[PDB]
Structure 1
Amino acid sequence: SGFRKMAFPSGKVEGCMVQVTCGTTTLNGLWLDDVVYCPRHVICTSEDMLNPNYEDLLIRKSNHNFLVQAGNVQLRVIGHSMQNCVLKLKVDTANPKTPKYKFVRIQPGQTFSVLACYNGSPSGVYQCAMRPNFTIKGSFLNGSCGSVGFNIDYDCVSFCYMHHMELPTGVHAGTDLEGNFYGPFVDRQTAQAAGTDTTITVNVLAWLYAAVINGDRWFLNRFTTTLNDFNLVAMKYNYEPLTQDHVDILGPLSAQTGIAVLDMCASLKELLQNGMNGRTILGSALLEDEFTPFDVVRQCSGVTF
């Protein structure tokens, strides 16, 4: 019992973090096999970051200008390429701690753990979601760039996120591990609009199932609704529209609890229209949208890595 925002155990990723320096910029990189991945903005000075010409800046650079360090272990860089907004530094040693891993581009609403790092060392680990508008609400200071987000499935690490920037509004943007930003962001210091954010409706519902499982049940009511009627209320409260695919993903939670999805929707409706009346659910006075249905099942059934 209890329900917590829980990160994956981070040890498989801790052994892949390195420090990358170029000129006087230092940030973090990820060492997998004989390739180090890092944000291409490692090659930018202070000048350059309002309007960087990344092709031209990188031409000024040679393999020996990339100082890559793992612990005290210096690595030797024998190749460099830029893919989209990441740099790939070929080194002469395969990381002996490389886990089984793949690179995945996640969908808005999906969750992952972030290992926040400075100077190639881990400071902490936390779980968060890719917002509908492709930002993340992290905790990241100068020097945290190249910190990665990941999921773990037994022994397989799925890397989904590399951190690149803080927007003027205090939220965070970054790339997948092929260097394609999530969202409309670019790697320059400019005004950039994040969309309107929405609440992740399907995640909220999963979390209400988690609450019932744990004995928090006050919000359950004698009402039902329809998809279309629920969607009209989702509208007004800036919630993502709910689809049958979402209903279907909620099925195993529906079956465990005996509470039909559309009845849970009617509960949510009533919370959205009436607020929470100064009550809490699972220790929160807000509706929480950073657990997926997969997350709730994993936690409520005690899956290991």
Structure 2
Amino acid sequence: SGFRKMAFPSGKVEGCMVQVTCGTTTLNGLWLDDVVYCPRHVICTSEDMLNPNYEDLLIRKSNHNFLVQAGNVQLRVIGHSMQNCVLKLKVDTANPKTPKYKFVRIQPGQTFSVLACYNGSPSGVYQCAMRPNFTIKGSFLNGSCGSVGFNIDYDCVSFCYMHHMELPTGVHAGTDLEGNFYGPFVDRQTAQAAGTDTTITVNVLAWLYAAVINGDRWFLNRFTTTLNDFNLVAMKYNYEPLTQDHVDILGPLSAQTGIAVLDMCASLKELLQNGMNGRTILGSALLEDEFTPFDVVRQCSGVT
């Protein structure tokens, strides 16, 4: 019993973190096979970041200007290329700790673990979600760029995020491992404001199922609703519209608990309209939206 914000075990990713230095900039890289992946802004001065021309800045860089250190051992850079907003540094040594891996581009509402790193050294691991406005709410200090987000399926690491940017509002932006930003963000120190950070409805519903499984039941009510009726209320409260696809995804939790998805929507509707009245659900005073239905099933079933 109990339900925690849980990250994947980080060891497989710890084995891939390296330090990348270009001139006076140090950040983190991800070493998979004989390629180190890092943010292309490693080549920028903070001055450069105001209006960088990355192709032009990169012309002034050679393989020997990219200093890659794995623990206390230097890696030899034998090639470099820019793919979107990441650099791929080809090294002469395959990472002996390379796990089975995939690069995946996640959808808003999907969760992942972040291994926050500084100077190629892991500092901590925490759980994030891709927000509906394609930001994440992370914990990243100067030096954390190139820290990665991932999911694990048994022994395969799916890398989904690399940290690039903090917005003036203190939320975070980054790329997939092909170097494409999530959302509209750019690797430039400019006016970038995030859109509405809506609540991930299907994740709240999943977490309410987790609450019922773990004995927190006070919020269950005598009501039901329809998707359209629920969505009128979701819209008013800046919740994401619930789709039949979301209802289908919640089916296993519905089955496990015997609470119909639309009954749980009616419980959520009352919580939105009535508030928590000073009560908590799984130790939270707000409706938690950074557990996916898959997360809830995984944690409630004990997948390794």
TM bracket (short chain): over 0.9
Q: Could you say what secondary structure the match of 1:82 adopts? A: strand
Query: What is the CA deviation profile of residues 103-153 of structure 1, one whole-angstrom value per residue up to 9, with x for unaligned ones?
Result: 000000000000000000000000110000000000000000000000000
Query: What is the CA deviation profile of residues 246-292 of structure 1, one whole-angstrom value per residue up to 9, with x for unaligned ones?
Result: 00000000000000000000000000000000000000000000000
Question: Quick check: 1:186 aligned with 2:204?
Answer: no
Query: What is the CA deviation profile of residues 159-184 of structure 1, one whole-angstrom value per residue up to 9, with x for unaligned ones?
Result: 00000010000000000000000000
Cα distance in 2, alignment partners of residues 49 and 132 from structure 1: 26
- Runs of 5+ consecutive residues of structure 1 not aligned to the other structure: none
Question: Quick check: 1:254 aligned with 2:254?
Answer: yes
In structure 1, the partner of 2:198 is 198
Q: Could you say what secondary structure the match of 1:89 adopts? A: strand
Cα distance in 2, alignment partners of residues 89 and 216 from structure 1: 50
Query: What is the CA deviation profile of residues 189-227 of structure 1, one whole-angstrom value per residue up to 9, with x for unaligned ones?
Result: 011021111100000000000000000000000011010
Q: Could you say what secondary structure the match of 1:202 adopts? A: helix
Q: TM-score, normalised by structure 1?
A: 0.99
Q: After TM superposition, where is structure 1 displaced by more than 6 Å over at least 4 residues in a row?
A: none
Cα deviation, residue 47, structure 1 = 1.6
Number of residue pairs matched by the alignment = 304
Cα distance in 2, alignment partners of residues 198 and 43 from structure 1: 35
Cα distance in 2, alignment partners of residues 91 and 169 from structure 1: 37
Question: Quick check: 1:225 aligned with 2:204?
Answer: no
Q: Could you say what secondary structure the match of 1:67 adopts? A: strand
Q: Could you say what secondary structure the match of 2:229 adopts? A: helix
Q: Could you say what secondary structure the match of 1:290 adopts? A: coil
Cα deviation, residue 46, structure 1 = 2.2
Query: What is the CA deviation profile of residues 17-56 of structure 1, one whole-angstrom value per residue up to 9, with x for unaligned ones?
Result: 0000001000000000000000000000122110000000
Q: Could you say what secondary structure the match of 1:255 adopts? A: helix
Cα distance in 2, alignment partners of residues 303 and 46 from structure 1: 44
In structure 1, the partner of 2:282 is 282
Alignment of 1:1-305 (within 5 A): 1-304=1-304
